[PDB]
Design a binder for this molecule. Sequence first.
Ligand SMILES: [Ca+2]
Lengths: 265, 257
Amino acid sequence: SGLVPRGSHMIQQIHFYDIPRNRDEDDRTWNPNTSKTRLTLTYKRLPYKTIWVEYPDIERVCKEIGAEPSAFGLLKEGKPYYSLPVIHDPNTGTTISDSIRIARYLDKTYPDTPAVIPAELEAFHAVFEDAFWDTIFMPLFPFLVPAACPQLNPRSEAYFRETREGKFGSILGGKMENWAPTGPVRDDRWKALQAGFTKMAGWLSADGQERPFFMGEKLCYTDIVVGAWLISVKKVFGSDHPEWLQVEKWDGGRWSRLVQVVENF
Amino acid sequence: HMIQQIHFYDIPRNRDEDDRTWNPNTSKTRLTLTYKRLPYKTIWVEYPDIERVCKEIGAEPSAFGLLKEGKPYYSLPVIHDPNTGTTISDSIRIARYLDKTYPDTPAVIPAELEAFHAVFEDAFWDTIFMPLFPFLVPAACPQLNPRSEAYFRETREGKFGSILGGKMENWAPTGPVRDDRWKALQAGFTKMAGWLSADGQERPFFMGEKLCYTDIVVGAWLISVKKVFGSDHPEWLQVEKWDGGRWSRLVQVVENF
Ligand SMILES: [Ca+2]
């Protein structure tokens, strides 16, 4: 046999860096920000593999593989902040951090996949992230963060508790157990979360219709962001948790429907 | 292209005709009309007469419960278009009406913008309107005609006075309180400029090269501040330099419609 192999030109698995929790492999993913990138990859039907990184190791892994910090000063007033998601794409040798920069890279590098963040979305999506921070993220924080924290592996649980209580504990009542304890405090915070999702639903129905996605019939990155936060809540709380089952009935079922979309990527 | 003038309902202030307009919300519609090059005449309505004027001409209320819980809320701007016999309230609904009725004018609110512009109005509310309120409202109030001054002061102090120090004079008095609030306002404009520069470039309008209704909204708020404070006021002169001159450039655009 004078036969030898010729190289394949199939797209190689992108290296996707994700934060595990204390579960077996198939239920290990949970994080809302890394879910943005995982959903972008699967929507584009790009191949990937997951490398698990615990919270206290993220900076050293990022420096090892050449990922830039995602911002400067979220925890330390004068120090860069390294976060996941990160991808290293061996097809090009490029490492990218921050889910928006990853989305742009994937649009640019794989133009035959469905585009997620065209230039005409960039400013309005930036507006959305700031509106979302105030009307969803901050009301959701006292729910998602205390639920996820004890699910983490011990090294991540300690880091996550210390940094998140360190950041927002003082305006949520102290330690996580006092942020939304079952009873009137949780109920008051729950009403605020429900009100935020209804305000966001109101954005989507502003024209008196019920478009499925912000642009109309076509999904884009900002739908993926909303879907990533919802998938995180569902994965952390559990699909039969009564509080998740309430969310499924919020705003005419709009968030159930979006979850069904992104789950079927 | 020969039409009758559109009737534009606007709120005066205590000045002669050519300087009577000032309001940020009615400026949204005035700018939309001028951008589309549609002829209009202005009918002046003082704040306490807006409801009865709206009911007389058939204008819908623009919100429900903003002043008292179970009570429709009427506001200006309103247009009545005699070319169709239609009266329209709320500047977003007026912009949609003008887009659809005059399709050969530049579209300002296409369907693909509607959700993102609604997002923007809420982000703008927190980022710009709230820090702007203690400056614009106390500056505008004494410029109003007496019947509007009393109404404006009573309604705006009743709604925001408790969280701002009570009477308007306590909202941003010259001294450290005004300094703190003025820095907060500049911080909000920088956040809004950061939206426009989010991709690392410096697009002139939210969508890129093409202006849309949400640029008109920001320009309407800027023109209101400039008209109220005065074009030589040292606080307005600072706004012209904020964020590398972005807001002075936008003002130049909308003034040039
Ligand atoms: Ca589950």
